[PDB]
Amino acid sequence: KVFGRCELAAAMKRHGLDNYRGYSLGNWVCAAKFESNFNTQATNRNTDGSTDYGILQINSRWWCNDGRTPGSRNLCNIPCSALLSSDITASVNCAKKIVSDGNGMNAWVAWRNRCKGTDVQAWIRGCRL
């Protein structure tokens, strides 16, 4: 599924991401925008054996298990295929874990480079929330 901007904001808000660990909703929408372009089926297969999965491009070394990545920790305790669903619940819960483990949103390279220090509120502006 390729989400719309306001549709993803609403779904992320229903999941409690607005101000989760001090990160406003716009930060989360912005991260998904430049990680996956709102595409729940996005994958990025890396040369190190790992793969980035889903709308927030969560990496398979630490966070999810795909059975083909060295050093697998599966800290979200899910198969990576769960991050490729049309519903974002599994990705949201794992993203919460990533931030909950003390990383912050800097863990997403797209957020650090394209959302950090920008008007992230623009990504939810005008939406029915």
Given in angstroms, what resolution was this structure solved at?
A: 2.0
Side chain identity, residue 74: N
Dihedral sign for Cα atoms in the order 12, 13, 19, 23: positive
Which positions make up the binding site for substrate?
101
Rounded CA gap, 75 and 102, in Å? 13
Domain count for the chain: 1
| 3 state DSSP class of 50 | coil
Catalytic annotation on 52? yes
Q: 98: domain CATH number?
A: 1.10.530.10
Which positions make up the binding site?
101
Rounded CA gap, 80 and 65, in Å? 5
Our measurement of the distance from residue 27's CA atom to the centroid of its chain's CA atoms, rounded to an integer in Å, reads 11
Catalytic annotation on 7? no
Which method resolved this structure?
X-ray
Give the position of tokens 């297969």.
Answer: 45
35, 48, 66, 119: the catalytic one is 35
What's the domain range around 59?
A: 1-129
